[PDB]
Amino acid sequence: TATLDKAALSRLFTDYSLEITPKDVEALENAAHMIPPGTLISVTFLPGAEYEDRARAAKRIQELGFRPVPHLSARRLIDEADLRTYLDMLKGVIDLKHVFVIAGDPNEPLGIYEDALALIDSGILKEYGIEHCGISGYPEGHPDITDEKLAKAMHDKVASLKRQGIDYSIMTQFGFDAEPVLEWLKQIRSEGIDGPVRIGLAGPASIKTLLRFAARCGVGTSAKVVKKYGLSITSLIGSAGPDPVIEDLTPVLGPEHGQVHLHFYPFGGLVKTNEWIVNFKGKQGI
């Protein structure tokens, strides 16, 4: 039994993914020795960077032996020329095969793309030779978007990518308990959504940082979950890692959940996050 439990944990941790901002290239260089070659590393898209900064980060990811995944924030783009400015820049520096497309955090779109589907269905990703497009998933819903609109958006984006012959994957918002993603993942399989799913996990970080992100992201923080994950603001430790969620995922994930990997959000710093992964695997004997 210990042997089979270790094997299931080793499979779940195979091909885990990471992310950086354009400000984190030095951290990536320091972390690289213990990051598996080929690891998918996102470059998130948020205000406060130039396209050149994002392209340089993606280039370094590739040079270090990893697979860059530029994020595209639809609502931050003014028009097709704006998007092509970034895509042309990326195509010139990386093997542009993976992107991740989201509506973006603006409350009001800045341009011609209302949401991720508007960008995806425009055809532009196919023009640039993209073979993999990731999309969001929200097992606990979203503060601004109804469950029904989230599900329809997922179905419409999957349908658009299928029509264009572009493979897709899903990356979920993190949670502080495994129950929402376990239920939600089986449900999307039932609706015929069979693409690979990367279950998002919050990396080890200060409890205050985790709770601030969770409030902004609409992540559940019921009393029972806060106690189980260890998120008390009077905690003697002051930080929390994702082991409570991993401990439910590894035994309960099954064939009914389909193709599943893990994604780590480095809320506490990329080096700290990957060191946690290395040390967790070591303590579990994998």
Ligand SMILES: Cc1cc2nc3c(=O)[nH]c(=O)nc-3n(C[C@H](O)[C@H](O)[C@H](O)COP(=O)(O)OP(=O)(O)OC[C@H]3O[C@@H](n4cnc5c(N)ncnc54)[C@H](O)[C@@H]3O)c2cc1C
């Ligand atoms: C894994 C992951 C990575 C992310 N990375 C980034 C990132 O790099 N940069 C970033 O800015 N954000 C990022 N986000 C956040 C995401 O942009 C926001 O959650 C956004 O509010 C919704 O984007 P979406 O792609 O899920 O929405 P979509 O699937 O595009 O939209 C879902 C539905 O809601 C509508 N809609 C979209 N936005 C709103 C709104 N604000 N109010 C009401 N209806 C709306 C759409 O028209 C559509 O009908 C990420 C989220 C996830 C889960």
